[PDB]
Structure formats: structure tokens, C-alpha cells
Amino acid sequence: SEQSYRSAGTLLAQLASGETTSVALVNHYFSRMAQFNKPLNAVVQQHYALALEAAARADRERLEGRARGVLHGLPCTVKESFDVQGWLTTSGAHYLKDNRATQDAPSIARLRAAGAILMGKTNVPMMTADWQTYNDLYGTTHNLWDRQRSPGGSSGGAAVAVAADFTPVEFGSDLFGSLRIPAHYTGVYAHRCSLGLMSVRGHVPGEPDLSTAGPMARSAADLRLMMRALSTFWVEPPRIPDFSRYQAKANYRVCTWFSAPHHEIDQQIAQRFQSFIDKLRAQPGVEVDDAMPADIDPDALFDIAVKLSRNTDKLRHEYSRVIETLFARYDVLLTPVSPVLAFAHMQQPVRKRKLIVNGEPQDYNEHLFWNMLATVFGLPATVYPLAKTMDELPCGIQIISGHFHDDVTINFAEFCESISGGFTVPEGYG
């Protein structure tokens, strides 16, 4: 099979029905990386021989009725900073250029046990500590929509690989937007899981207290499929998210938070959000309120975020109660991921890095402002690609909900797919 941009869900169906095999899929993805990865520099380790062997095994198992696992026979790549047994985990640092993992990171092991075929790893900035993706070991990852621009970071290689169909899904860590920001800039879906829903151990730098992890994909159903594979609670659940299937709702009540004093977004995002909200407000049973609680001072929360990045705790626990009541009244909260769309590479020292909002220079740390909320309170957040004209860059929206409401945000993204937005194939790719 040579068809490009099939979803994981479709691919699993076609494996079951014999319209494709795992060997044909591994050859598809490595073929696309041969044809397209050089100018993008998204996949920085390739393990073809191991992947082809694993695919042959999956195919034998399928034929003999011995296939097991919800990802059985599905190839993928993972973020370079997660341990895969026998593979290098450099995190783009010279000090670790020959650091090879002894065992899988626990979430990697859980993809492998679901039957995923790991074909390689995708680029990260050094120690995954930036909102761009570049390092001295592997080079810069370029945004496939405009290669003079960054796909963001730290999961930038993963977002580009998904958007180029080098892989149907990806898996990465998210501290302050590490998964969400590259999804926004690059036009793919991402889900950062609730704190405690899945292990982030076996990550370099990397059970961490703020970092979570989750999938990238090109549909909401594929995000849900990954979470079926990945979820292993290590906190006591306040409730059990249901990842079994899309659960459609008759009523949605949505909160928006698109600006704060001194934290404005570019008018282009503002108009594209407004156009999306207009369509959402026109749906039966849907209310959309501009109802961010004023109880949460954004500057106070930013100061907490800056500190984390007996007194702060006091405020943090009080704000977490304001969020619980918020998500008893609203199903989801929609916010920006960044105040800008994808920018040209900025590898100067941090201090000199600017984001141009409505013509004015703004702080690079606006990335932290628009991602601290889910990070600080351990919340789930799905990033959903909005529509784009061929003359527009990708733009995502961040769908947040209460702790262990991961099913709610992913279900909300699938409902949005019926309204506006979704994955768009970049011009020049399959």
C-alpha cells in the first residue's frame, strides 16, 4: 500500500481486512522519510532493520490469528528524549551523544506491548528546554509549512513527522507546552494527559511533578486510540476517563479565555478564533461564554509558573478549587496555545528572542503564559488544528478540562471536527 495520510484508525481497519500489511506500512513511512526528511530534519534516528523485522512478525501473527494489542502492527516514531531499549537518548546534548537506554521508558514499553512498531525518534532541542527544535548533535528542525520557520518545541520533530506522514501518530512529553506548542505551529493534534494518568519516567531530562505526556496525531479518534494504549493511572482517579469510543453530547457549555491584560494575541489568531466560535455558537445545544473566573489572577499564576519553571502552595491549592468549580459548570475551556503563528528561527540567547504581536515585540515567555494553566494544575489539554487557507499558517486552539477529564477534551475535539478545522495536508506532500 502506498496511500498517504491514512489515520491510525483506518490503518488498523485495513490491516484487519488485508488491504495492507505492516511491512507495506513500514516501507511507506521510510520511503516518505527518504523522499522528504532531509530538508525538514524531523526524524533523527531511523531503525529500518528492527522495524521491518517487527512488521514481518506482526504480519505473521495477524495471519495466524495471534495478533494482540490495540496498536498491533501500527508503526510510529517517538520523541528522541524517551528511552527505547538499545537506542540512544541524547536529548540533543553532547554529554549524552552516546547514552544508550538499558530499558524502555514505561510509556514506550506500553506502546510496544500494545503492538506498536517503533521505527525511530524525532528531534528535540537540547534537554527539551526550548519552544524551538534545534541542537548541535542533529541540527535544526524546519516547519514543513515554511522551512524558514520553527515548528516549535520541544516536540517539534514529532509534529513535523506527523504532518509529513512519516508516521501516523507520535508520543512526547509536555511540561510547559512541549507537546501543545509544536501542534499549534505545525498543524497537528496533540493531547497532554492529566497529571498521573500515565508515566513520564524514562525521559531525559525527565515520576516528575509537572511534566506529563501524550500523543500527536491527525484526528481526535487517533488521539483516543493512543490513550487507550497509554493510560496507566498512578494517582488515584477522581473519575475514570472512557477512551473506548467517541461519546457525543447533546449539550456543550464552553468557556473561552482568549486574552488577559498585557497578554494579548495577534489579531490574526483573534479573527480565526472568533470565526470558529461563531460556528460553534450556531450549533444546537451549544453555549459559549467568555467566562474565565476573575478569581485566578493571571499575573499571580504566571509568577507561580515562573517559580516552578507554604505560600505559593496555598494559592495553588485555592486556584485548583476555582478550576474544579469551573469544570463543574463548563465542559471545556478554550484558550490560545501561543499569541503568534509560526515564527522564523530564533536561536539567539533567550533575552533577545521576541514574538511580534500586532506589530509590537512581546516576550518569548508568552509561550509559558498560555500553557501554564494545564501544567500548574495537572490538567488535560487537547490542541486542535483550526482551518487554514493555503495562504495562512496553521493555528491551533487549546481545549482544557478538569483533572482526569481527558476523554472530555478529546471528545470535544472530535465534535469540533463536525464543525470546522481538522488536519490539512501541506502542499507538496502526499
Numbering used by the authors: 2 to 207, 215 to 317, 368 to 488
Give the article text.
ClbL crystallized as a homodimer (space group C121) and a single polypeptide chain consists of 487 residues. The overall structure displays a compact mixed α/β fold consisting of 12 α-helices and 12 β-strands. A lack of electron density is evident in both monomers of the asymmetric unit, suggesting that the disordered loops are relevant to the protein in solution. The protein crystallized in an active conformation, as is evident from the covalent conjugation of an unanticipated small molecule to Ser179 in the active site. Electron density corresponding to the phenyl group is not clear, suggesting disorder/nonspecific interactions.
Colibactin is a genotoxic natural product produced by select commensal bacteria in the human gut microbiota. An amidase, ClbL, plays a key role in the pathway, catalyzing the final step in the formation of the pseudodimeric scaffold. ClbL couples α-aminoketone and β-ketothioester intermediates attached to separate carrier domains on the NRPS–PKS assembly.
